[PDB]
């Protein structure tokens, strides 16, 4: 019943955890506690098998641990800066090669899977700093330039006409812009990792940079030059919707250093590069 | 038009809100989905798989595979202690195991834990060990006799290399904090020699043992939070 | 959300408008009404009663 299912959604009780059943003393030549990790399988032994348990009714749910929930939270993926210092025509616009690799927090989460397929919700948070006292009337234009489309080279470039590309215009004072994007890959899933090259020569590129080109985000302050200089910082937040993930992997253990690569740096004292805290010895808790 | 009342909250951006929004690419048709083995639907699926505990992570061992092994050998004193650690899911050395890492993305935890141990000595090496779990409200046991009074398993090494000890959920509250908190510390796990490491002549006098951890059917995490087991101290560039 | 078009007039305060508004005292239960003689429902009721005309209102 879509209604009963509905109630489960409101209460977040879609995935319940099993109860613990009462168990009793045993004397048998069947030893569940014994197994062989060599097989590659995890011993499925449960509490009832090793101790005398009571009956307990579980009310915990796994809804919040779902992949949709894990990746369904908006996080920052880019901080775009437009700092008008001394040349409005040059400093009033910029561009960014889109990717989800510049901010560790969300990058690490997605990278816990090998492949993932999802729709995206983008929310933008622009903040105008009045460097000289006034901000006047700020209007912004965020244009998505898919790979191949002409990238504007000046604040009045014809490409800003956006005759086909999708552009979003925001007016200072109005609520934060937000829009959705469908799964964009030319493949069936996004590659979080890619053990391949774009060629077979010593100079061929390696990794996700070969497969994850998302194009460019071009921004510009639509308003023409004003007396008072401003610094506009637009933070882009991303959230995955209708998510699917495949082949889980270990979490990143060391800091990230670059985009599209698993490269890392190690100091002379490696224990400082990982979250593992040295133990005094084996018996010191 | 229809009279409306704008309510507080309007226009705000909550990172965890769940609203709809216009699609920037109308008419676009996504690439067809193909079958890919290994789909994961819930993180619990990953918490149920055994991963190794870097139990021997002393400063000199970190950065070596040996940080994952415990060495056993013939004893000259009976009932000697082998190792001892906190049972707290996100405490060290459990922190970097897969289940510890995932638990670190949540604020609350509950359920029973499954600790497994694989003996790696020769096929001719014998040994009986006592693995014990001490519920909270008391210090870690100082002797085998003290430990043995709690939950425990006596492991006899033989044809089957591995044994599992289940740490039952014995708590006052239904959940505990994943981060170190006095009120919710879960207790300890200690290992002691039950008999002794014994070998015939011409056989290595020491042997390694591996330790795994995973969650039982009742394991569950709650209240998503950002992890403190990874950080970003600078920009990540191209 | 549901696309809406804010119409002119929005946000204005017309003294003769007829809208609803949240109640500042939730759960409050007004005092019971009792019968009081002389209820008036329409001003016409008062226009139908004779009153005196100050017809001789010379200054003195």
């Amino acid at each position: 019943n879509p209604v009963e299912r509905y109630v489960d959604e409101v209460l977040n009780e879609v995935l319940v955890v099993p109860n613990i059943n009462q168990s009793h003393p045993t004397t048998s030549n069947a030893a569940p506690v014994l197994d062989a990790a060599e097989t590659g399988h995890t011993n499925k032994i449960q509490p009832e098998d090793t101790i005398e348990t009571r009956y307990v009714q579980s009310s915990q749910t796994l809804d919040e641990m779902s992949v949709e929930s894990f990746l369904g939270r908006s996080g920052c993926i880019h901080e775009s800066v437009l700092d008008i210092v001394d040349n409005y025509n040059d400093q009033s616009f910029t561009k960014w090669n889109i990717n989800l690799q510049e901010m560790a927090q969300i990058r690490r989460k997605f990278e816990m899977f090998t492949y993932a397929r999802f729709d995206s919700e983008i929310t933008m948070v622009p903040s105008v700093a009045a460097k000289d006292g006034h901000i006047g009337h700020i209007v912004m234009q965020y244009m998505y330039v898919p790979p191949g489309a002409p990238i504007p080279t000046t604040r009045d470039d014809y490409a800003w006409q956006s005759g086909t590309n999708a552009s979003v215009f925001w007016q200072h004072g109005q609520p934060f812009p937000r829009f959705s994007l469908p799964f964009l890959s030319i493949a069936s899933a996004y590659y979080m990792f890619y053990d391949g090259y774009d060629g077979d020569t010593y100079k061929s590129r390696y990794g996700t940079v070969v497969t994850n080109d998302m194009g460019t985000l071009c921004s510009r302050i639509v308003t023409s030059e004003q007396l008072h200089k401003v610094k506009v910082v637009t933070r882009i937040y991303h959230k995955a919707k209708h998510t699917k993930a495949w082949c889980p992997r270990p979490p990143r253990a060391v800091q990230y250093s670059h985009t599209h690569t698993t490269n890392y740096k190690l100091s002379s004292e490696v224990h400082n590069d990982v979250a593992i805290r040295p133990r005094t010895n084996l018996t010191t808790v | 038009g229809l009279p409306v009342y704008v309510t507080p909250g309007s226009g705000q951006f909550m990172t965890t809100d769940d609203m709809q929004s216009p699609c920037a690419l109308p008419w676009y048709h996504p690439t067809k989905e193909i079958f890919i083995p290994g789909e994961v639907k819930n993180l619990i699926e990953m918490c149920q798989v055994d991963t190794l505990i870097p139990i021997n992570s002393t400063q000199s061992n970190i950065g070596n595979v040996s940080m994952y092994t415990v060495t056993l050998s013939p004893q000259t004193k009976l009932a000697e202690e082998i190792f001892a650690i906190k049972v707290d899911i996100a405490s060290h050395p459990l922190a970097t195991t897969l289940i510890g890492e995932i638990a670190s993305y949540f604020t609350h935890w509950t359920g029973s834990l499954r600790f497994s141990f694989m003996f790696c000595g020769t096929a001719n090496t014998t040994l009986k060990v006592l693995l014990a779990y001490t519920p909270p409200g008391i210090g870690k046991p100082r002797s085998r006799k003290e430990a043995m009074l709690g939950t425990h398993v006596v492991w006899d090494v033989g044809l089957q290399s591995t044994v599992s000890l289940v740490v039952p959920w014995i708590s006052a509250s239904q959940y505990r904090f994943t981060t170190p908190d006095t009120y919710s510390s879960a207790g300890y796990i200690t290992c002691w020699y039950q008999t002794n490491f014994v070998v015939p002549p011409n056989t290595p006098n020491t042997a390694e043992m591996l330790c795994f951890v995973s969650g039982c059917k009742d394991f569950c995490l709650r209240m998503a939070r950002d992890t403190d087991l990874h950080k970003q101290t600078g920009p990540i560039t191209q | 959300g549901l696309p809406v078009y804010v119409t002119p007039g929005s946000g204005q305060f017309m003294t003769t408008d007829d809208m609803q508004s949240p109640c500042a005292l939730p759960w409050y239960h007004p005092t019971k009404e009792i019968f009081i003689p002389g209820e008036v429902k329409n001003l016409i009721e008062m226009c139908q009663v004779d009153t005196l005309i100050p017809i001789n209102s010379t200054q003195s």
């Binding site: 509905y6 949709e68 369904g72 994007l181 919707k241 | 769940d18 929004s21 | 549901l2």
Partner: peptide, 29 residues
């Protein structure tokens, strides 16, 4: 786009835009 259920407890799973990407978080399992 209204998925009107009835039980009375009526459910209105409305989809305000004409693209699937536009809708909110997915249901589970």
């Amino acid at each position: 786009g209204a998925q009107v259920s009835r039980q009375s407890l009526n459910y209105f799973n409305i989809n305000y835009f004409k693209d699937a990407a536009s809708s909110g978080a997915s249901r589970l399992d």
